[PDB]
From Swiss-Prot:
Record organism: Escherichia coli (strain K12)
Organism placement in taxonomy: Bacteria, Pseudomonadati, Pseudomonadota, Gammaproteobacteria, Enterobacterales
Protein's name in the database: Isoaspartyl dipeptidase
Regulation affecting activity: P-hydroxymercuribenzoate causes a slight inhibition (8 to 17 %). Iodoacetamide, o-iodosobenzoate and ammonium persulfate do not inhibit the enzyme activity.
Residues reported in the UniProt entry to bind Zn(2+) 2: 162, 201, 230
Post-translational modification: Carboxylation allows a single lysine to coordinate two zinc ions.
Gene name tied to this protein: iadA
Length: 374
């Protein structure tokens, strides 16, 4: 016989496919880490060496895209002892994360972008999709190449810049330095084919989003580039984030915070406020604090259970919404052409199998592919 296993053909059949938009019992043909077919009832012999897998009675949706992870570690806000460790591959793949955006937090003295870049690339080699934000709470930003615009532009894995405002751990940035920073991220993005966003870590200051509004006055960076996070950290601020989302901006809610506005409670209030889910994403801020990624899947579950969101609508803030905000071409959605980043769940939404770019990451709910030193 002839050898065709080079194509790594795999057919996920008979599952209740949510892409996230609720389709029916659809089949998904995968080849070379790519979804090459999506139409109910596909032949188990349509292609040669095809690893056919029976997912009858199971749910099939896109893997999660988590855009807030301290990949190489974080913390340190209470001495060097509080410096959290780096993130383990299995930790991510088990929480159903197939695409992630790394970043640095408060500590930008013992944590450098070159290391994050390195960890991001190491992750991509191991099986998942990783990107990173340059800078840290600090403004002006400590970059790799000398300027934010240059980083976003020519460093292949940088998709935008991060920073921190209305927080007691900022660098006390002024509107000009802030505006300039975002403008560089925006221009850089265009030159590099990157979303060129600016993610703002929100603190507990009364000022809240005022700096983000002040910025809009002093420059012309589209509001579709300014992403505030941890908006659910205090109610007064959350309320403003909603108003900000009502103006066309997107808001990021961290699943690692459970009060005063819980994650689900957050995604929920937004809908009630009348915000298209498109402008709402959910991040974990994993390995921060030591934060974990369990709360991502838990926010989906609780959304479908405790609140009255549907499986499809619950998934959005963790997939398509995120994908559409960073312009992560080929992700967060199951269609021919897109990447075979998949999650096999039980009817009760309990991740059983995980697929990343075709390769199988989680077999029995436990990763079967791990980082080099786990
Ligand atoms: N001090 C804090 O509230 C923690 C910080 N917001 C973090 O992202 O971990
Ligand atoms: Zn933060
Ligand atoms: Zn953080």
């Amino acid at each position: 016989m002839i050898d065709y296993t080079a194509a790594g053909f795999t057919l996920l059949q008979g599952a209740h496919l949510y892409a996230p938009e609720d389709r029916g019992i659809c089949d998904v043909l995968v080849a070379n880490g790519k979804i090459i077919a999506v139409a109910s009832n596909i032949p188990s012999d349509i292609v040669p060496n095809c690893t056919v897998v029976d997912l009858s009675g199971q749910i099939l949706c896109p893997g999660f895209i988590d855009q807030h992870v301290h990949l190489i570690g974080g913390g340190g806000e209470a001495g060097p002892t509080t410096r959290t460790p780096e993130v383990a591959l299995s930790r991510l793949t088990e929480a159903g994360v197939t695409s992630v955006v790394g970043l640095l937090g408060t500590d930008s003295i013992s944590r450098h972008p070159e290391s994050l870049l390195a960890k991001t690339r190491a992750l991509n080699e191991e099986g998942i999709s990783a990107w990173m934000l340059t800078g840290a709470y600090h403004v002006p930003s400590r970059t790799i190449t000398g300027s934010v615009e240059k980083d976003v532009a020519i460093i292949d894995r940088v998709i935008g810049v991060k920073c921190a405002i209305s927080d007691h751990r900022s660098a006390a940035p002024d509107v000009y330095h802030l505006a300039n920073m975002a403008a560089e991220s925006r221009v850089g993005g265009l030159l590099g084919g990157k979303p060129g966003v600016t993610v703002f870590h929100m603190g507990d200051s009364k000022k809240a989003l005022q700096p983000i509004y002040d910025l809009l006055e002093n420059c012309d960076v589209p509001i579709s580039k300014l992403l505030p996070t941890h908006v659910n950290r205090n109610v007064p601020l959350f309320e403003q984030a909603l108003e900000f989302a009502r103006k066309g901006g997107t808001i990021d809610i961290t699943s690692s915070i459970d009060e005063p506005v819980a994650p689900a409670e957050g995604i929920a209030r937004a809908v009630q406020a009348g915000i298209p889910l498109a402008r709402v994403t959910l991040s974990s801020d994993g390995n921060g604090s030591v934060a974990g990624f369990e709360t991502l899947l838990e926010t989906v579950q609780v959304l479908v259970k405790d609140y009255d969101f549907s499986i499809s609508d619950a998934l959005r803030p963790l997939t398509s919404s995120v994908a559409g905000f960073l312009n992560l071409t080929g992700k967060g959605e199951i269609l021919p052409g897109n990447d075979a980043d998949l999650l096999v769940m039980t009817p009760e939404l309990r991740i059983e199998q995980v697929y990343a770019r075709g390769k199988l990451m989680v077999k029995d709910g436990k990763a079967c592919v791990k980082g080099t030193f786990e």
